[PDB]
Every structure is written in C-alpha cells, then in structure tokens.
Amino acid sequence: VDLYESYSLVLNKSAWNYNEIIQRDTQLTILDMALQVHLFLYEGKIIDIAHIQKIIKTFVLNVFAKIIKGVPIVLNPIIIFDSVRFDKSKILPVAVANPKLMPPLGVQDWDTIVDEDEEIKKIVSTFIKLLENALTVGHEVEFFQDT
Amino acid sequence: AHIQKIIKTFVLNVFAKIIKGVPIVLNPIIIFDSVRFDKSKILPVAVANPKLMPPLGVQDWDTIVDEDEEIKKIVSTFIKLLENALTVGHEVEFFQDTLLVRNVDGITSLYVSEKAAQVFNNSVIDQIMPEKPKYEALEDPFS
Amino acid sequence: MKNLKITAIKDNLIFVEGEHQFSFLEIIKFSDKVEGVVLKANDRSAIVAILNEDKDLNLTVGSLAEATGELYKIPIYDNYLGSIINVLGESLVKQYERTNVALDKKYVFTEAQPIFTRSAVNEPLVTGITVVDGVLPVGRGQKELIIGDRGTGKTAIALNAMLAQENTDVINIFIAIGKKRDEIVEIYGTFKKHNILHKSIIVSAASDDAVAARYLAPYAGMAIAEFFQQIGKDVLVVMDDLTNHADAYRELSLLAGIAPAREAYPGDIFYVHSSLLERGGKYGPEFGGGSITILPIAQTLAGDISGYIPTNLISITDGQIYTSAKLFNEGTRPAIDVNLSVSRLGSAAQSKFMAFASSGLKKIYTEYKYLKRLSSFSSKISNRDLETLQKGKAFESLIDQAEYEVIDYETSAILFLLLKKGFLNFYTEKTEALKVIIGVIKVFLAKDVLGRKMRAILVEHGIDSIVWNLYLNHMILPLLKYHLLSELQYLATNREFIKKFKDIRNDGRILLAYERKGYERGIAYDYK
Numbered sequence: 001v002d003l004y005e006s007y008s009l010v011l012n013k014s015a016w017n018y019n020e021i022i023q024r025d026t027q028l029t030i031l032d033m034a035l036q037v038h039l040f041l042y043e044g045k046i047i048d049i050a051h052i053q054k055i056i057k058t059f060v061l062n063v064f065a066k067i068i069k070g071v072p073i074v075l076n077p078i079i080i081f082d083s084v085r086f087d088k089s090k091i092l093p094v095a096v097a098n099p100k101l102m103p104p105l106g107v108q109d110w111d112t113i114v115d116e117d118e119e120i121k122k123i124v125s126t127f128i129k130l131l132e133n134a135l136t137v138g139h140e141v142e143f144f145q146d147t
Numbered sequence: 148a149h150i151q152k153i154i155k156t157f158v159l160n161v162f163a164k165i166i167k168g169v170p171i172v173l174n175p176i177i178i179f180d181s182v183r184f185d186k187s188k189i190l191p192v193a194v195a196n197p198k199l200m201p202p203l204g205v206q207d208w209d210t211i212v213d214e215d216e217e218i219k220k221i222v223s224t225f226i227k228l229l230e231n232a233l234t235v236g237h238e239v240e241f242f243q244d245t246l247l248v249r250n251v252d253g254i255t256s257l258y259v260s261e262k263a264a265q266v267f268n269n270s271v272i273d274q275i276m277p278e279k280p281k282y283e284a285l286e287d288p289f290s
Numbered sequence: 291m292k293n294l295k296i297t298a299i300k301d302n303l304i305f306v307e308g309e310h311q312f313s314f315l316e317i318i319k320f321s322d323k324v325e326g327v328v329l330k331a332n333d334r335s336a337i338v339a340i341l342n343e344d345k346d347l348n349l350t351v352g353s354l355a356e357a358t359g360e361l362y363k364i365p366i367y368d369n370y371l372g373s374i375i376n377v378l379g380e381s382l383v384k385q386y387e388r389t390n391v392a393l394d395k396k397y398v399f400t401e402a403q404p405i406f407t408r409s410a411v412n413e414p415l416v417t418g419i420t421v422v423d424g425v426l427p428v429g430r431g432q433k434e435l436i437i438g439d440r441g442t443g444k445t446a447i448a449l450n451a452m453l454a455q456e457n458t459d460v461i462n463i464f465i466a467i468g469k470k471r472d473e474i475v476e477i478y479g480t481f482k483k484h485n486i487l488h489k490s491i492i493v494s495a496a497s498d499d500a501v502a503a504r505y506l507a508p509y510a511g512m513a514i515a516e517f518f519q520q521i522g523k524d525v526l527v528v529m530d531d532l533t534n535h536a537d538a539y540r541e542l543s544l545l546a547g548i549a550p551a552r553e554a555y556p557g558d559i560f561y562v563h564s565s566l567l568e569r570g571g572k573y574g575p576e577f578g579g580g581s582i583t584i585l586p587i588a589q590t591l592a593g594d595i596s597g598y599i600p601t602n603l604i605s606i607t608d609g610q611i612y613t614s615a616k617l618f619n620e621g622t623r624p625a626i627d628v629n630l631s632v633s634r635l636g637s638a639a640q641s642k643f644m645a646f647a648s649s650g651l652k653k654i655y656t657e658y659k660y661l662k663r664l665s666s667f668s669s670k671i672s673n674r675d676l677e678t679l680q681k682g683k684a685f686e687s688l689i690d691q692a693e694y695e696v697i698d699y700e701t702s703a704i705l706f707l708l709l710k711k712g713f714l715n716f717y718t719e720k721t722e723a724l725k726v727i728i729g730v731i732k733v734f735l736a737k738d739v740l741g742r743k744m745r746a747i748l749v750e751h752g753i754d755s756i757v758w759n760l761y762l763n764h765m766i767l768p769l770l771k772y773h774l775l776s777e778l779q780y781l782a783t784n785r786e787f788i789k790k791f792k793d794i795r796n797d798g799r800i801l802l803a804y805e806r807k808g809y810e811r812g813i814a815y816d817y818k
C-alpha cells in the first residue's frame with residue numbers, strides 16, 4: 001500500500017511538519033486572532049479581548065465536536081473542514097484540496113452550529129475573514145489545540 | 148548536453164523539495180513523495196493520487212521550474228516523454244542511481260541503489276547537498 | 291464659394307488675394323480638409339499659416355481658397371476619449387467610432403474667466419508619488435511646473451500623475467508639442483495597459499508638423515479642457531513641453547519678419563505663455579464649477595534654472611518640481627531635488643492628516659542641506675543639529691520609488707507620520723534595511739485587509755483618534771521594533787530606543803511571513 005494508506009506514516013509526517021513550524025516560532029495563536037478581531041471591531045462597540053478568545057475557543061471546540069461525528073463543516077468557499085478515518089476506528093481531521101469542484105457531500109454552513117445571537121455571529125464572521133486574510137498573506141494560524 | 152543539464156537540474160530540485168516533506172506532482176498518475184521512519188532515515192517513493200485523503204502541501208512541478216519559455220518547454224517535454232515511456236513499459240532513471248518502473252495497472256515504484264540511499268541519508272543527516280549539475284560534453288559511447 | 295487666390299508662397303506662409311473682411315485666426319479653407327489661419331490682412335490680401343497638409347492637393351500659386359468668415363474653433367466629438375488627435379480634430383489613432391455630430395465648438399483663443407469666477411484651491415490631486423504628495427502638494431486647479439534637465443524623468447512624473455487617476459473622476463489630457471511619434475504611441479499603449487484610456491485624450495503635433503499646428507496645439511487642448519470643465523468635471527492637463535512651444539512661436543515670428551529679443555525669442559513670448567496658462571484653475575459653481583490642473587514641462591541647459599524661458603514659466607505657475615541630473619546619475623529615481631522645488635499652495639492643498647503628517651519636513655530638509663554644506667571649527671555637534679541630520683537622512687530614503695508605481699495617499703501620509711514622529715532615525719547607519727522595511731510596510735498597507743482598514747480609519751476618524759493610535763501601536767510599530775532589533779542589536783540598550791519602544795511588543799511575524807511567501811517560489815539549484 002502507499003504511505004497515505006496508513007495512519008502511522010501520515011501522523012508521523014504531520015507531526016514532523018507541525019514540530020518544525022512550532023520550532024520556527026512564526027505561527028499565529030488564537031490570542032493573535034482575538035486581538036486582530038478586537039482591533040477590527042473597535043469602532044462599533046469595544047469587545048473584551050479575553051471574551052473574544054473564549055468565544056473563538058468555544059466555536060473551534062464546536063467545530064471539533066461536529067467533525068468527530070463525521071459531518072464536514074464549510075467555513076468558506078475556500079476552506080472546508082472534513083475528517084478521514086482509517087482502520088481500527090482511528091480518525092484524522094483534514095482540509096481538502098479543490099473545494100471548488102469536488103465538495104464533500106451534505107455540507108452545512110457554519111451558521112448552523114453558532115448561537116443565533118447577533119454579536120456571536122458577527123464575532124465569528126470577523127474571525128473567519130481575518131483567518132482567510134492571514135492564510136492569504138502567508139501566516140500559519142492555529143485552529144484546534146496543537147494543530 | 149544543455150537538455151541533459153536542464154533535466155538533471157529539475158530532478159535535483161525535486162530531490163531537494165521532497166526531503167523537506169513536500170510532495171511533487173509531475174502528472175495525475177505519478178506523485179513523488181518521501182517516507183521517513185525516524186530521524187536520519189528517509190526513503191523516496193512514487194505514489195498514485197489518493198482518493199479520499201488529499202496529500203499535505205502538494206506542489207506542481209511548474210513551481211520548481213524557471214519561468215523562461217525554453218526551460219519550461221524542455222521540462223514539459225521531458226515529463227511527457229517520461230509518462231509515455233512508463234506507460235509503454237520502460238524502466239526510466241530519475242535520480243542518480245535510481246530507477247522508476249510502472250508495475251501492473253497504475254502502480255509506480257522507485258528502486259534505490261546503495262549509493263543513492265547513501266546520498267539521501269547524507270543529505271538528511273549532515274545537509275550535504277549534491278553539487279549543482281554542470282555542462283558536460285558528450286562522451287563517445289565506444290572506447 | 292472660392293473667393294481668394296494664392297499669389298506667393300514664401301517662408302512657409304501663404305499669401306492670398308481677394309476682397310473680404312478678414313479677422314485674426316479666421317479659417318481659410320483650401321480644400322475639404324486643408325485649412326489655414328489668417329495672421330495679418332489688408333482689405334484685399336492676407337497672410338496665412340497652414341495647419342495641415344494633403345498629399346494630393348498640390349497647394350501652389352493660383353490655387354483657389356475660401357474665407358469661411360469664422361474663427362478657428364475646435365469641434366468636440368464623443369470619441370475624443372481614448373484617442374490621439376491633431377489640432378483640427380482628426381483621429382490619428384482611435385479606440386471607438388465617431389458619430390459625426392459635434393457636441394460643441396470651442397474657440398481656440400477663448401479669454402480666461404475673470405477674478406470673480408474663481409475659487410480657492412482646497413482639494414488634492416494625487417500624483418502617486420510620495421514626496422510630491424507629502425512635501426510638494428498639488429491641488430485641483432493648481433499649475434505646477436515640471437522643470438528639469440535632459441533625460442531626468444519629467445515625462446515619467448507627469449505620466450505617474452495621470453496614471454494615479456485610474457480610480458478617480460479626473461479626465462486626463464496630454465498635449466504633445468514636437469514629440470517623437472514612437473513615444474506618443476508608447477504613451478498610448480501605457481494608457482491602454484493601465485485602464486485609463488477611456489478617460490484620456492492625446493493632442494499631438496509632431497516635430498516636423500506645421501509650425502502653426504505646433505504653436506496652436508496647447509490652446510486647442512485647453513479649449514477641450516474648458517469644454518470638459520463647463521460640465522463641472524476635473525481636468526488634468528499635461529503639456530509636453532513648453533520649450534518646444536516657445537521654439538515654434540519663435541520660428542513663426544522670425545519667419546514672419548518680427549524682430550528678435552532676449553535669446554532671440556520674440557518680445558511677447560511671456561504674454562503667449564501667460565495667456566495660455568491663465569485658463570486653468572478652480573471655478574465656482576455658477577461658472578461650470580470644475581477645475582483644470584496643468585502640469586507644464588520645461589527643459590534647462592546644464593541645470594541653469596535662471597534661463598529666460600524657465601524663469602518666465604516660474605513666474606506664471608504656482609511652484610515647480612526640479613529634477614536633478616546629478617541625482618539621476620546616481621540611480622536615484624525620481625531624481626527630484628526637494629530643496630530646489632516648492633509648492634505655493636502648501637498645506638492648504640492637502641488633507642488634514644497629510645498636512646499634519648508632514649508639517650515642517652521641507653524646512654528640516656533645507657536645514658539639513660545647509661548644515662551638510664557648512665564647514666565649522668568646533669567638530670562637536672549639538673543635539674538639535676544631530677536630530678536634523680538624522681531626520682534629513684531618513685527623509686532622503688522615502689523619495690525612491692519605482693517607475694509607473696502609484697502609492698496610495700494614505701500610505702504616503704502614514705510614512706510621513708512615521709518619519710515625523712522620529713521612528714526612522716535609528717536607521718541612520720543602515721539604509722538598505724530602511725528600504726526593506728518601507729517596502730514591507732507598503733505591501734502590508736496595500737494588500738492586507740488590516741492595512742486597508744488602517745487607511746480607511748485614518749481617513750474617517752483622523753490621526754488623533756484612539757482607534758488609529760491602537761492600530762499604529764499594535765500593527766506597524768512592533769514590526770519596526772523587531773526589524774531594528776534584528777538589524778542593529780546594540781539598539782536594545784539605547785536610551786531613546788527604550789524611551790520610544792517602551793510599551794511596544796517585539797513582534798515581527800509580518801516581515802517573516804512575507805519573506806516566506808516571497809521565498810516560497812524558491813529553488814535549490816538554478817537552471818541558468
């Protein structure tokens with residue numbers, strides 16, 4: 001079989017890449033995105049930065065809980081969060097290529113898994129926009145814990 | 148000799164790109180990757196395109212080729228001829244002292260000599276990169 | 291019907307005979323296309339300067355002509371925009387088809403509107419050049435001369451100023467007097483490439499065209515600009531160049547028999563240029579309510595700014611921009627000599643944030659040159675002189691800018707603010723590092739959504755607001771601190787460095803990310 005067909009080889013490669021990026025110390029944590037959101041939203045109402053960090057972490061944990069149940073989540077036409085499971089029930093979160101022409105089946109918007117409050121939706125939308133911009137310019141953003 | 152130097156430069160760029168964990172796609176059929184078991188132990192492989200788990204950070208060959216039209220045309224022709232030779236059933240050499248074969252169906256394999264694996268391990272342990280290819284005049288095949 | 295007959299052709303002038311009531315610049319029609327203008331006239335004879343030529347006409351003695359009885363008026367057509375035309379309105383190179391119905395007819399020598407029709411200049415004209423937009427401001431309705439030596443980049447400055455109007459409402463007009471055709475075609479291609487062709491006109495009079503055409507081209511261009519201004523539009527006019535226009539007028543006058551004067555130019559060359567250039571400015575709503583901004587170009591000899599024509603033009607325009615051949619020889623582009631340039635409108639032709647950002651930098655630069663050229667006995671330099679020298683050297687590194695590069699107004703304002711607050715002085719030992727950091731800051735402000743947000747909030751809330759201070763303190767200053775620590779480690783202990791970069795985190799991930807992005811198209815072994 002091929003190096004992709006097994007959990008151990010892919011995990012080793014992913015861990016090596018993550019460790020290298022961590023040891024470079026050039027990645028943007030959740031605090032950085034919270035501060036960017038606070039600065040971008042600092043002209044409609046001031047939102048506490050710690051509040052934004054807590055909200056972002058709860059949202060990403062909601063995404064984690066949804067992806068561990070085998071339901072892909074689409075955050076943007078560009079980024080779609082999915083999961084790939086190998087033998088022995090092992091699973092691994094992934095971001096797919098070409099999300100434009102081969103979209104995963106039964107995709108749901110993020111708006112479904114977010115509280116209906118206007119503030120929470122605005123905060124998460126701003127976070128998503130900043131994440132897209134940071135990825136475009138060439139940053140390395142952390143989404144789940146230790147990823 | 149110019150074309151040979153250009154091809155060697157392209158394969159060395161692929162070699163340098165795959166030891167850093169970056170797979171290189173030359174065509175929808177052949178994708179060059181690396182498998183590392185531990186520090187100081189890596190091995191180049193050729194794999195098909197996976198169906199449900201897209202590879203991590205795949206780059207086209209076009210990324211690692213100069214933008215000049217002549218260079219791009221030479222490398223494109225080399226890739227096309229390599230694909231045809233693999234399809235018909237040849238055994239083409241890609242790196243120095245290695246061999247690229249296409250087995251039954253669409254499964255491709257890369258067989259590594261002793262010294263090729265030695266140079267791979269030297270590159271990964273001591274960062275001793277192979278020297279840049281140079282223009283070598285053609286040598287008479289006989290005598 | 292024909293009522294005149296040609297009797298002589300001397301000195302490139304046509305002498306016609308026939309009873310008529312001639313007038314100055316009355317159009318004489320020799321065929322359906324070839325026309326001339328009456329210069330002097332008796333009650334039965336006239337002297338005419340031709341405007342164009344035809345291959346098949348064979349205009350000689352005895353040819354018949356008609357005195358149309360009307361003045362030289364240029365007609366306006368819908369397809370002028372995005373085309374090159376001559377002085378009579380013929381499309382040499384056109385982009386769209388023409389409907390043969392004239393929108394208007396504008397007199398070539400229309401007198402300038404009187405004093406009560408004007409208005410004060412209060413709106414900037416973004417030229418896309420940092421040093422021009424910040425220290426030598428150009429407003430809407432202001433005449434700024436571009437004076438310089440041969441091959442120093444004046445045409446490039448005018449072209450940059452017009453290309454900066456890609457996302458505005460300002461109509462560009464380029465009048466070319468005695469230029470090369472292969473350069474006019476290249477400028478046309480440049481206009482087509484940058485998507486400003488649909489709002490740009492070119493009026494062309496080649497170096498070997500008729501002398502009357504070269505003399506009357508700027509007036510025809512000004513008539514077109516006046517037509518556009520009468521419907522309340524901002525017009526930016528670039529005349530390239532008035533040295534050729536003065537030469538054409540001198541040639542016409544000397545061949546017509548007029549006596550010479552200083553430098554062999556006729557005695558009324560100043561009146562020519564002043565009555566030409568007094569037709570641009572800002573106008574009140576009751577009289578069109580638009581503006582005509584003019585950027586004439588003129589050439590000196592060996593950097594002699596005290597020449598007759600350069601000083602005649604300086605006394606007409608509202609300041610000047612001087613391009614130095616010494617600076618150009620050193621690879622400094624644009625080769626603008628700020629110490630020899632000036633804008634007479636000043637901070638009144640700038641935005642509030644731009645005016646505050648560069649309040650006293652030009653005077654500081656003049657003082658920096660004066661101290662640099664001064665020789666003294668005490669080799670001890672006071673703190674004020676050290677600050678002046680450092681700030682002048684830092685200012686010298688903001689001038690450099692690539693060809694055809696348009697820098698946003700807010701980016702220039704932010705850079706001038708950074709210079710004014712004293713953050714760029716620490717680069718007094720390394721200038722390449724300063725260039726790199728300026729490039730990184732410009733890229734960040736142009737591409738990132740946070741940079742555009744910073745520029746937008748700078749425009750709407752001003753510099754003094756809390757939000758912009760937070761943006762500056764959390765986005766730009768950390769990058770400068772990180773870069774200064776990286777390039778110059780000893781600054782970690784400097785007193786002033788500690789004083790300014792006190793509550794600033796040493797964050798430099800933007801520069802590293804951009805460096806990674808640039809180097810990601812990198813190869814271990816080169817092919818060449």
Ligand SMILES: Nc1ncnc2c1ncn2[C@@H]1O[C@H](COP(=O)(O)OP(=O)(O)OP(=O)(O)O)[C@@H](O)[C@H]1O
Binds near residue numbers: 438439441444624692
């Ligand atoms: N900012 C710039 N960066 C780099 N090159 C530039 C810049 N501005 C102008 N140049 C180049 O410098 C040369 C001279 O400029 P340009 O032709 O505009 O000057 P000029 O004063 O109009 O000259 P001429 O006397 O020939 O009319 C040209 O090759 C032009 O492309």
Ligand SMILES: [Mg+2]
Binds near residue numbers: 444445
């Ligand atoms: Mg020129």
